[model samples]
Target: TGIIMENVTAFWEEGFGELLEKVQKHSSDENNVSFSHLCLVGNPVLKNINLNIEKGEMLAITGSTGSGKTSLLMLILGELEASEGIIKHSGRVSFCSQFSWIMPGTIKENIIFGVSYDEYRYKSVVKACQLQQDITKFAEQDNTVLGEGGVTLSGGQRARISLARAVYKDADLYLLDSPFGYLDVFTEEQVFESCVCKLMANKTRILVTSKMEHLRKADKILILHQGSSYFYGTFSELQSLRPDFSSKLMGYDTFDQFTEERRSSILTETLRRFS
Candidate 1:
């Protein structure tokens, strides 16, 4: 009886080992993780999009309001079906949508969400997202209940929580949809540096943002125009190749002038007027 039991266990172990080996091989293949001439039709939101997002790189996407930025991300996430071309990826993705969801629970609960908690990691994310200050303002700090139905958070606070939840998940790819839109200029800089550029430095991040001031931090930038790939290259490359387009897209003549505090103040008001 003992010998039979041992033989059965060995057989099962051998079969499981083979299955795991095949999965590992597939997941580690770099060529398998890419989008090739991807196109989404019907409404024609994305057309003939071809891009490769390398591991551990920051890719920024910017364009006009209806330029298919969000649509492109949706295709990558498999939320939107491609009408043409192939999309393939072997790793997990964490997405922070433009609109965030708030649960009827404590602030900590919302941040941790579906992921298990690590005290050290939780603290780091809270600090990076600038949630510590907001948390303190609550009666129970992180434990403060947001309540049900009637509870609502300001855009900045909601974005922070959404960001924190994504960071905590620690997926292979992060798809951020204008995560900094609600933030003021100073807060935008702070969170972008600490939470995004710093914290997720080693992760492959695809960010769709209107704030062109931070394009320098991106490894590559993709400009979409009317569901087509308008430009794909480095920030400086775009400026050199197409000065007119660069000026119009970035709303600035030079990077130096764009970074000035006075310019940011003016741009802030301009955005308010249009937004």
Candidate 2:
């Protein structure tokens, strides 16, 4: 055979410099990614919504029912086209919906979900989502098959698996919609601390949740009321602006000897209004 020079590729000094320059330019352009004057639906759902999510920042969105929380996320994900404005994002987006979906397959297949496997990333996600212990409980561990009368997983388990898949994908942005809703309070704290807060610390994350306690851990909080922006700022800033509202949401000054009446009052007040 000949030297095969025709198919061979070579890199020169200028080529590498030009590539590097272009890479830097592309990254710099991503810094201004945001949504401006976003609106949804021809029927008028969300109205004039604006948000700027910085790289590696955590934003929490809290809203009551019919507040268009899911609608906003769907718009960003292109599942629903915006009636107005534009979405500017520079990288991939990973969405973990409020409802978890599982196909009939092995646990490993379910978690990997057709993506190329990376042992290190897989194991890390398994641990971060508190799924290692759960996996070990099965007869074949991660290889254990599910569905078709094989084994029925709990709601919490399914939710964690969904989260593990998203984390293992290693996307640039994460849109998590109440990923902790199925787990109990204790398990919720554990998974949220390790998986959502710690493991995703270096990624751009937008979480939609009704849970007010977790709002304190977010870099910034957005409160939506009736499909419009009600409040958007840091926890301290929110507290300064609306002390009574913040106190009620945080469940502060509601504890008294842990009596039934005290617990009832706290639950009543906290659960009374979703907004």
Candidate 3:
């Protein structure tokens, strides 16, 4: 039952040349994904964070813009280096990013990407993700190629397709980064109930959500603030201990400003890192 990070720190060094030079010179063994050492802890996007997540738990991450909510997931995935302390996970990860991550292929090819497809499982996932209707509307249905002129997928469509891909993968851990950004009110409830709460019930899952209404659904709620963990506990504790915090979350407008333009750029950055 597990994922663990102790005294973890992260440096999001993008351009600082001096440290970048030194960091480049002192990388680690690429084979192993876990380490407990020190390096350039500059531009500390995450600092002294500690995470202990039990198996079969659903943890929700919430924070304002630029608070490193997304970075926490990247650190867990080992996409970004941790400058100090240990970070380990007991199982494989399947990620559906905050972005509408897709590829230049048919809709079906994208959903069943690189995995051996199962008929019932595929249809089940498609329905759960709320992609069945969209898929059927396509000129060639599931076989329709993405990026074909006149067949432009909407923001919500792409988001669900990406989610479908992630959910279709049989993995032990699922990391979903604020996928509800593109979905409407009706679909959010539907997908949340069918996909995450039901389809992934037994898996260890960490999902980011700006909307506070989903607070009660999580086994744990981690609130981040300006790159550091602000609060961590159950919704009941938050309601009792941090009533002001919970009150603001009721109509929180700041985090909901994660606009299409900003998030689209982030998706591009994620793609660049993957390449």
Candidate 4:
């Protein structure tokens, strides 16, 4: 899987990428996904964001609220359509979002979605998403159907289910939009280790989250800002360049004071969605 962009705006019809030249270095690759000098035809949110997300790469995108960084994901997901720039995707994309896409169906159905069932992958995904325990305890278990608008789910339950759905699919790219917002510290760790680091070990993942652990775990970081400001590089590279922002990257667990700034998926390139 791959994703390379040079301030290019808009989505790639395919999910795909390759040898990532440096952020600003001349771009190169058949690319799982590539954007060159991309510009939005609408609000002009992201401009020439030079970044590369190589195969099996965990690209974490950070930024202020309303900075329009999430929109970049939109570009890839193709919601921010008809924009300009060099964007290419070479893989089939599977995505999940901070706001889980719960459907009115049984947990099993939700996870299965439309894909053919495979017990091996299903079991692994269920365990990886940490849904086994919760489902086991449920009166109806995984067989329980969401009565309407889906049975009410805990933040953790809902998040895990959505993740389960995403992981159940086999795709070159996995786009996780703020995937860590719901779980507790312990759960987060397990999900990160077993699910993200293990189940998705060899697949490319674009996790758009703000947690220091989540962000730090990513091999690559993209610090996107309001009005099309993008900084991409190694953590040390970011530390030296954005000394002020680097400070916050060291810790987390504070929400009351930080909501002023904030936190924020992935999906098929062809999935119809609301903007």
CA lDDT scores, all candidates in order: 0.67, 0.66, 0.73, 0.67
- Best-matching candidate per lDDT: 3
Q: State the RMSD for candidate 1.
A: 14.9
Candidate 1 residue 57 C-alpha distance from true site, Å: 0.3
Ranked by TM-score from best down, the candidates are: 3, 4, 2, 1
Over the stretch 1-275, how does candidate 4's per-residue lDDT look in tens digits? 38777557543232211111211111132233223322122235566677777888888776654455556776777665535666766768897866676777889999999999999999999999889988998799998887765546777787888899998999988888766765454676688889998888789888876566666678898766553545678777877876655554343455312321243311111011211
Q: lDDT by residue for model 1 over 158-233, one digit each (tens)?
A: 7788788888897888889877765355676788999888988988888887667657788888876656666777
Question: Model 3: how far is 43 from its true place, Å?
Answer: 2.8
Better candidate number, 3 or 4, judged by lDDT: 3
Q: Candidate 1: list runs displaced more than 4 Å.
A: 1-43, 148-152, 248-275
Compose the digit string of candidate 3's lDDT tens values, residues 1-275. 66777888888655322432332111342334222222243467788888788898889887655567877887877767889889888668998876566677889999999999899999999999988778787679999888752247777787888889999999888999878875365676788889989988888999888655556799888877667777788999988876766664444464334453444344333323332
Candidate 3 positional error at 35, Å? 24
State each candidate's clash count: 0, 0, 0, 25
Please estimate how well model 4 matches the true structure, expressed as its whole-model Cα lDDT: 0.67
lDDT per residue as tens, model 2, 84-137: 664567567887877677778887887888799988888888999998878899
> Of the candidates shown, which would achieve the greatest TM-score relative to the real structure?
3
Which pairs of residues have clashing backbones in candidate 2?
Answer: none
